[PDB]
Amino acid sequence: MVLGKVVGTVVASRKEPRIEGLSLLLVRACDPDGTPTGGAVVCADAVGAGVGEVVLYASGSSARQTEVTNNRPVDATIMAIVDLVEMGGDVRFRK
Protein backbone atom coordinates (compact mmCIF):
# COMPACT_ATOMS: atom_id res chain seq x y z
CA MET A 1 0.00 0.00 0.00
CA VAL A 2 1.22 3.47 -0.91
CA LEU A 3 0.48 6.37 1.40
CA GLY A 4 -0.62 9.19 -0.87
CA LYS A 5 -2.68 12.36 -0.99
CA VAL A 6 -5.69 12.95 -3.24
CA VAL A 7 -4.86 15.85 -5.55
CA GLY A 8 -7.48 15.86 -8.29
CA THR A 9 -10.16 14.05 -10.29
CA VAL A 10 -10.18 12.54 -13.78
CA VAL A 11 -13.42 12.52 -15.77
CA ALA A 12 -13.30 10.11 -18.69
CA SER A 13 -16.26 10.00 -21.04
CA ARG A 14 -15.29 7.28 -23.52
CA LYS A 15 -14.22 4.60 -21.08
CA GLU A 16 -14.24 0.85 -20.75
CA PRO A 17 -17.78 -0.25 -19.81
CA ARG A 18 -16.90 -2.17 -16.63
CA ILE A 19 -15.38 0.88 -14.92
CA GLU A 20 -18.46 3.03 -15.47
CA GLY A 21 -19.57 4.50 -12.15
CA LEU A 22 -16.08 4.62 -10.64
CA SER A 23 -14.65 7.90 -9.38
CA LEU A 24 -11.10 8.25 -10.68
CA LEU A 25 -8.85 10.31 -8.41
CA LEU A 26 -5.41 11.80 -8.99
CA VAL A 27 -3.30 10.80 -5.98
CA ARG A 28 0.30 11.89 -5.47
CA ALA A 29 2.49 9.86 -3.14
CA CYS A 30 3.42 11.69 0.04
CA ASP A 31 5.89 11.49 2.88
CA PRO A 32 4.37 10.44 6.28
CA ASP A 33 3.56 14.02 7.38
CA GLY A 34 1.44 14.69 4.30
CA THR A 35 3.20 16.71 1.62
CA PRO A 36 2.68 15.47 -1.97
CA THR A 37 6.01 14.54 -3.55
CA GLY A 38 6.00 12.42 -6.69
CA GLY A 39 4.03 11.75 -9.82
CA ALA A 40 0.28 11.37 -9.82
CA VAL A 41 -1.59 8.06 -10.03
CA VAL A 42 -5.14 7.75 -11.31
CA CYS A 43 -6.83 5.35 -8.92
CA ALA A 44 -10.37 4.18 -8.36
CA ASP A 45 -12.22 5.29 -5.27
CA ALA A 46 -13.48 2.47 -3.08
CA VAL A 47 -13.84 4.17 0.32
CA GLY A 48 -15.19 7.58 -0.59
CA ALA A 49 -12.14 9.82 -0.80
CA GLY A 50 -12.19 13.47 -1.80
CA VAL A 51 -9.67 16.08 -2.88
CA GLY A 52 -7.10 16.78 -0.18
CA GLU A 53 -7.31 13.52 1.76
CA VAL A 54 -4.36 11.40 2.78
CA VAL A 55 -5.22 7.87 1.68
CA LEU A 56 -3.71 4.41 1.40
CA TYR A 57 -4.02 2.99 -2.09
CA ALA A 58 -3.20 -0.52 -3.28
CA SER A 59 -1.75 -1.14 -6.73
CA GLY A 60 -1.77 -4.23 -8.91
CA SER A 61 -3.95 -7.33 -8.73
CA SER A 62 -4.69 -6.49 -5.08
CA ALA A 63 -6.35 -3.34 -6.45
CA ARG A 64 -9.11 -5.68 -7.66
CA GLN A 65 -9.71 -7.25 -4.23
CA THR A 66 -12.82 -5.17 -3.70
CA GLU A 67 -16.50 -5.73 -4.49
CA VAL A 68 -16.44 -2.36 -6.26
CA THR A 69 -13.46 -3.06 -8.52
CA ASN A 70 -13.63 -6.85 -8.87
CA ASN A 71 -13.09 -7.79 -12.52
CA ARG A 72 -12.36 -4.30 -13.87
CA PRO A 73 -9.22 -2.91 -15.51
CA VAL A 74 -8.26 -1.17 -12.27
CA ASP A 75 -4.57 -1.28 -11.36
CA ALA A 76 -4.85 1.11 -8.40
CA THR A 77 -7.66 1.58 -5.89
CA ILE A 78 -8.01 3.57 -2.68
CA MET A 79 -8.36 1.11 0.17
CA ALA A 80 -8.21 3.36 3.24
CA ILE A 81 -8.57 6.93 4.49
CA VAL A 82 -5.79 7.66 6.95
CA ASP A 83 -6.53 9.01 10.44
CA LEU A 84 -3.09 9.20 12.03
CA VAL A 85 0.43 8.44 10.81
CA GLU A 86 2.81 7.88 13.72
CA MET A 87 6.56 7.53 13.12
CA GLY A 88 8.29 6.23 16.23
CA GLY A 89 7.00 8.06 19.29
CA ASP A 90 5.69 11.02 17.28
CA VAL A 91 2.54 11.61 15.26
CA ARG A 92 3.50 12.92 11.85
CA PHE A 93 -0.08 13.23 10.57
CA ARG A 94 -3.42 13.95 12.24
CA LYS A 95 -6.64 13.76 10.22
Binding site: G48, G50, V51, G52, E53, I81, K95
Partner: protein, 92 residues
Protein backbone atom coordinates in the same frame (compact mmCIF):
# COMPACT_ATOMS: atom_id res chain seq x y z
CA UNK B 1 -13.24 20.03 8.00
CA UNK B 2 -14.71 17.86 10.73
CA UNK B 3 -16.20 14.47 10.02
CA UNK B 4 -19.97 14.34 9.61
CA UNK B 5 -22.38 11.89 11.20
CA UNK B 6 -26.09 11.76 10.54
CA UNK B 7 -28.90 9.64 11.92
CA UNK B 8 -32.30 10.03 10.29
CA UNK B 9 -35.27 8.71 12.25
CA UNK B 10 -38.94 8.86 11.33
CA UNK B 11 -39.92 10.30 14.67
CA UNK B 12 -38.69 13.06 16.96
CA UNK B 13 -38.39 10.81 20.02
CA UNK B 14 -36.07 8.30 18.38
CA UNK B 15 -33.98 11.18 17.07
CA UNK B 16 -33.60 12.71 20.53
CA UNK B 17 -32.57 9.30 21.90
CA UNK B 18 -30.13 8.93 18.98
CA UNK B 19 -28.67 12.39 19.58
CA UNK B 20 -28.37 11.75 23.31
CA UNK B 21 -26.52 8.49 22.76
CA UNK B 22 -24.29 10.09 20.11
CA UNK B 23 -23.21 12.89 22.39
CA UNK B 24 -22.75 10.62 25.42
CA UNK B 25 -20.74 8.11 23.38
CA UNK B 26 -17.83 10.27 22.21
CA UNK B 27 -16.63 13.84 21.83
CA UNK B 28 -18.91 15.02 19.05
CA UNK B 29 -20.84 18.25 18.64
CA UNK B 30 -24.56 17.88 18.03
CA UNK B 31 -25.20 20.83 15.75
CA UNK B 32 -28.94 20.30 15.61
CA UNK B 33 -31.48 18.57 13.47
CA UNK B 34 -33.16 18.80 10.09
CA UNK B 35 -36.90 18.44 9.53
CA UNK B 36 -37.70 17.27 6.02
CA UNK B 37 -41.42 16.72 6.55
CA UNK B 38 -43.42 13.54 6.72
CA UNK B 39 -42.15 12.72 10.19
CA UNK B 40 -38.50 12.56 9.16
CA UNK B 41 -35.92 14.24 11.40
CA UNK B 42 -32.15 14.00 11.05
CA UNK B 43 -29.72 14.54 13.91
CA UNK B 44 -26.34 15.84 12.75
CA UNK B 45 -23.08 15.54 14.71
CA UNK B 46 -19.63 16.86 13.78
CA UNK B 47 -16.25 15.81 15.11
CA UNK B 48 -13.24 13.57 14.60
CA UNK B 49 -13.65 10.48 12.44
CA UNK B 50 -13.35 7.93 15.25
CA UNK B 51 -15.48 10.05 17.59
CA UNK B 52 -18.19 10.47 14.95
CA UNK B 53 -18.05 6.80 13.99
CA UNK B 54 -18.33 5.50 17.57
CA UNK B 55 -20.98 8.11 18.38
CA UNK B 56 -23.03 7.15 15.35
CA UNK B 57 -22.79 3.44 16.17
CA UNK B 58 -24.08 4.08 19.69
CA UNK B 59 -26.78 6.42 18.38
CA UNK B 60 -28.01 3.77 15.96
CA UNK B 61 -28.04 1.14 18.73
CA UNK B 62 -30.07 3.41 20.98
CA UNK B 63 -32.46 4.70 18.34
CA UNK B 64 -33.35 1.22 17.09
CA UNK B 65 -34.77 0.45 20.54
CA UNK B 66 -37.05 3.51 20.39
CA UNK B 67 -38.01 4.43 16.85
CA UNK B 68 -37.74 3.71 13.14
CA UNK B 69 -34.17 4.34 11.98
CA UNK B 70 -34.27 5.35 8.33
CA UNK B 71 -30.60 6.00 7.64
CA UNK B 72 -27.28 6.12 9.49
CA UNK B 73 -24.17 7.38 7.73
CA UNK B 74 -20.74 8.82 8.49
CA UNK B 75 -18.86 11.02 6.01
CA UNK B 76 -15.22 11.13 7.21
CA UNK B 77 -14.35 14.32 5.31
CA UNK B 78 -17.13 16.14 3.47
CA UNK B 79 -16.34 18.47 0.60
CA UNK B 80 -16.05 22.23 1.13
CA UNK B 81 -19.07 22.94 -1.09
CA UNK B 82 -21.17 20.48 0.91
CA UNK B 83 -20.51 22.46 4.08
CA UNK B 84 -21.10 25.69 2.16
CA UNK B 85 -24.44 24.67 0.66
CA UNK B 86 -26.04 22.40 3.26
CA UNK B 87 -27.05 23.04 6.91
CA UNK B 88 -24.30 20.89 8.41
CA UNK B 89 -22.95 23.19 11.12
CA UNK B 90 -19.60 24.11 9.55
CA UNK B 91 -20.78 26.78 7.16
CA UNK B 92 -18.67 29.98 6.96
Amino acid sequence: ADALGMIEVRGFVGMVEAADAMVKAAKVELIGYEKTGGGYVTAVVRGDVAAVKAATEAGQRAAERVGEVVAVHVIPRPHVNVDAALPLGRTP
